[PDB]
């Protein structure tokens, strides 16, 4: 099975430096190109660039908004792909793709075709602040299905994960995108779950944020 | 420095409906690719070397063109195809996507489910005091929310967020929350949560008194 796997991305102050990295694994990571892409939030992807394969020389190309910036480097020791990024500007915040390229072979068909789940890169002055977590209870089994919620604010910077019920509950699970306001970000997270469960089993939602190393579980009482 | 545009830039669909995704260079290319890249997923490719279907890709797609005009298009619309589709070409260096093309999928109207909940005991020790309001899976998209203390309209302090179509039933959801320091919130009794959508001529709406106990 075919694995890429994004790292390094947070939080990053303008005009200073980050790199990331691309763990690999599923196939000879030395026959094969690896290029960079990103997506700023809500925006249209852009290639960055890609380095060649031994063959070729592990040479690179770059896009024109970044050259000079970035390098593309790879430690085919321990067959992973890095982006350095220099000077970094608020443009540069988004969700960074490492994508294995063309390959000795003609499988086509395989190219451009694997991409990592990505990872988020914040270029920011602002500091960072881990999450108030607050429960969202009804306030009077008036129906067959009572939605719940969850209340994440005032943290620093993104991403956060919600879950509920250690993941057991995916069904009926909404988690709008998270708004910023004034150097703070807020999301809400809501579960639909019917009456009879509940309050009879008992849900709680999981939030997460590794940028300040914050993690706690918040049980829905009713109210 | 081969710039693509793609149009239209945002289209909504009706089941069986032949969709057509047009991307336009400023130079030639010899092919041209696609992507189609779902909400909260990472791009998949869809068509390469112009039109040849990747894996698990439907035949109802399929991709034409040269030079500097390109299209991919799939003859009947299904749930499934729902997706912000990008082109790309790798005929010159650098690789360049397109705009993009945000496909949604036209379904039956749906009316919203309204969930106000009132500030956590918790959040209120802390001295602030934030109302959420859940307006869950409808559809169209056009949805208006609008708060209501104690029978006026209130605008500042209110943050909106909206989700993408969802895969499961094809419906948006939207949450609104309405921030206010514990002073304000206690100095009013009444909160509602007023929704104006196309199923209905008045108002959803959904309120709550503040209690005390
Ligand atoms: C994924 C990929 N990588 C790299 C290259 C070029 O490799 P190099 O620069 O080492 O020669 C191509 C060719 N583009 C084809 C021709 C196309 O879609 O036009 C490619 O599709």
């Known amino acids: 099975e075919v694995k890429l796997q994004e790292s390094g991305g947070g939080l990053v102050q303008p005009g200073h430096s980050l790199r990331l990295s691309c763990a690999t694994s599923?196939?000879?990571?030395?026959?094969?190109?690896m290029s960079w892409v990103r997506q700023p939030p809500g925006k249209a992807l852009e290639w960055l660039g890609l380095i060649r394969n031994k063959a070729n020389g592990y040479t690179k190309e770059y896009s024109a908004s970044v050259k000079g910036r970035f390098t593309i480097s790879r430690d085919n020791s321990q067959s992973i792909l890095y982006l350095q990024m220099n000077a970094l500007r608020a443009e540069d915040s988004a969700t960074y793709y490492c994508?294995?390229?063309?390959?000795?072979?003609?499988?086509?068909?395989?190219?451009?075709?694997?991409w990592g789940q990505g990872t988020t890169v914040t270029v920011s002055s602002a500091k960072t602040t881990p999450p108030s977590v607050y429960p969202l209870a009804p306030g009077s089994q008036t129906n067959s299905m009572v939605t719940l919620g969850c209340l994440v604010k005032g943290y620093f910077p993104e991403p956060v994960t919600v879950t509920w019920n250690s993941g057991s509950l995916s069904s009926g699970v909404h988690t709008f995108p998270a708004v910023l306001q004034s150097d703070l970000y807020t999301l809400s997270s809501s579960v639909t779950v019917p009456s009879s469960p509940r309050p009879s089993e008992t849900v709680t939602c999981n939030v997460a944020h590794p940028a300040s190393s914050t993690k706690v579980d918040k049980k829905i009482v009713p109210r | 420095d081969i710039e693509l545009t793609q149009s239209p830039a945002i289209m909504a669909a009706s089941p069986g409906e032949k969709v057509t995704i047009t991307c336009s260079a400023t130079s030639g290319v010899n092919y041209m690719h696609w992507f189609q890249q779902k909400p909260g997923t990472s791009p998949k490719l869809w068509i390469y070397?112009?039109?040849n279907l990747a894996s698990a890709v439907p035949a109802r797609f399929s991709g034409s063109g040269s030079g500097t005009s390109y299209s991919l298009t799939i003859s009947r619309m299904e749930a499934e195809d729902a997706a912000t589709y990008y082109c790309?070409?790798?005929?010159?260096?650098?690789?360049?996507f397109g705009g993009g093309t945000k496909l949604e999928l036209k379904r039956a109207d749906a009316a919203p489910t309204v969930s106000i909940f009132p500030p956590s005991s918790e959040q209120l020790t802390s001295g602030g005091a934030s109302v959420v309001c859940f307006l869950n899976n409808f559809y169209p998209k056009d949805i208006n929310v609008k708060w209501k203390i104690d029978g006026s309209e209130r605008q500042n302090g209110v943050l909106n967020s909206w989700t993408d179509q969802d895969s499961k039933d094809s419906t948006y959801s939207m949450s609104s929350t309405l921030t206010l320091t514990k002073d304000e919130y206690e100095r009013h009794n009444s909160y509602t949560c007023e929704a104006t959508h196309k199923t209905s001529t008045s108002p959803i709406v959904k309120s709550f008194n503040r209690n005390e106990c």
């Open positions: 994508v294995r390229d063309k390959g000795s072979y003609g499988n086509y068909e395989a190219w451009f075709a694997y």
């Open positions: 070397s112009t039109s």
């Open positions: 790309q070409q790798r005929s010159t260096y650098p690789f360049t």
């Open positions: 599923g196939f000879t990571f030395t026959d094969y190109y």
